[PDB]
């Protein structure tokens, strides 16, 4: 059953078309009577195959980046951890009880972001940068990746200045 | 019951369907009506994207997937072996097993016309008598009432003789290796004396 | 007589399905034996260990970097063997008997299987004659007869090799004094050690004469 | 340009699978990924079996898409060696990370080789 | 000095202290250096730390 | 049809005791996995299960 | 290649032939 024997099945080798021509005129009438039972097909969007343990398996999402924010139609964010050949395993930033099998997964097009800036100063945010202090959205702010690589050897210098704790045992 | 013996013993769960498909098509003498009906369906998946959506898309309901397949195959004289197979593969969502059944249906079919393929590599191209003396060597390398076809290639790295290649074994009665098998025998024996 | 009794064997082939971590899964090789030497077309050998229904699992005697998907692996027809005989004395071989001391091929030697059935009840006799270790903590308290397996167990750097090396060195001192029939020929198998550690031992064994 | 240029088939953290349409790279070969934000080389670890190699990323894989073109360099990771590399800082793939310009090299040796043989050892203390 | 998966602060400390020691010389006297540094420190992904 | 949400309650139709299942995960292929709040002895494959 | 979606099948049942044999055997005369 090797691929040398399977890629011979690319080229046609039937030499008798009495069933190709028959069902090609009955297939499209057959599919047309079952259209309210088809979910619309999904290629660049996603559809949830399995959800449970706080991990969703998402069919589709043909052009997700590894480790980017996906958005379920429930409004929950996820992060595409492993892109597999057939599905995408996302980890759900929130409660997985609101994600169902069959739900649309939308792509945000960005690796996982938080709002950074001067306007995030003062605020109580959650693990994803969404504010929970109740005093509005974050303004005067911009998105930055949460998995930046640390600066290398040549981007650093020695530690020279003191950070005063105010704790007497510590700063002594 | 009593089914025919399949010529080959194969692997599992897609090669195991194909040897059952061969056995009910050997009982009904439909071993080549079922084979090209497989070959039609291989071509049917290439042209219709909604027929191969009934094999890859996991969100197609199983009541849809078995009713599109049955209501499409109800006519055009398909074997009752075929349209029973295809509703069985659509009941379980195993319609994507069909490239792998067709490959294993071929290996059972080619071992039923005992036709075994070959490749003979020689030093220079053959005579018509060098062809006839060689099959007399080569049908003693197939162990039943099998027929060899042949495929003739050349290699002057061989110094005469031939190399028969059967895609699962080779036999090298070329004299280029008979030199090396001679030399290493006398390079071993003078070190034993 | 060799040429008048000569047919070349059919060589059964196999294709490498997948390869990695020193294991090659092989399609084909339908007549290979369990525990048989195979030969890859990269020159590296292998041993067929688990013969599954769909593939053969082959452990690779060497670096698996030279094996690709779809490489041709040929069976050799033979269970794994090594050269035995007196020509192995004095030589440093590798795990399959090929010499690595750089002194040419193993002359005066004969290939025998490495997995032999151990001698049974009717082939034994009582262990009665002593093997002198030369280590007097051993030969007084825990003495060793000839035909007895004795464990040297301990932690690291506690002297387990030194008990073993002194058994080998002492046999050289005893072999110069006994008749030819009762002389002890040592074999030291060094598994998983450094190559520097092994080159220090053949330096000691050459200097002692062992 | 079509064959010996595979595509990213699946990404699981540091481990990438690339599918090559013909002529798989050897195990330990280096594979460059085209279109990444940084230079991402992948060292081939395994042949998975269906024209797929399993390889290890020498940098981060956040950003890899499942069709991304992967070229094979036909050799392992080859780093600059010599007296020109003295006083420089290199990373895993031999790039200078000290901002002192390119490393002039006597040779570019692959980072994979065998041990010295038993005849090559020196026993001196 | 192969730094495999350790602190990047320590890579900067050794590099700077080798420049003031003259073990590493920068600029046109680079050839009079005695040490070359290879660093795969603990911020790297596990493929880079497995091969450095 | 549509699956119950995770942590939804399911009641098994026709059973000696009221059997309540709580949906633990969506397994795929239109199956949910449930943990029972009572004994599952006497439960038949194909018994009707109502989503609350 | 447009047929490459079907090259690798995976099944929802280990006992798939025990359902296939319950539909192919009564197709025999
Ligand atoms: N009887 C002894 N008298 C003095 N020194 C000894 C003795 N035995 C061993 N040593 C010293 O102790 C060290 C450990 O010995 P040895 O190498 O034999 O231990 P080992 O059990 O082989 O350890 P490992 O194999 O774990 O390295 C050696 O350097 C050896 O020089
Ligand atoms: Mg030791």
Coordinates of C-alpha atoms and ligand atoms in Angstrom, one line a residue, chain C residues 157 160-162 188 193 197, ligand 2:
Chain C
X157 CA 34.0 5.3 42.0
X160 CA 34.4 -2.0 41.0
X161 CA 36.6 -1.9 37.9
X162 CA 39.7 -2.2 40.1
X188 CA 36.6 -7.4 29.3
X193 CA 32.1 3.8 28.9
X197 CA 38.6 5.1 29.7
Ligands
LIG2 MG1 34.4 1.6 36.3

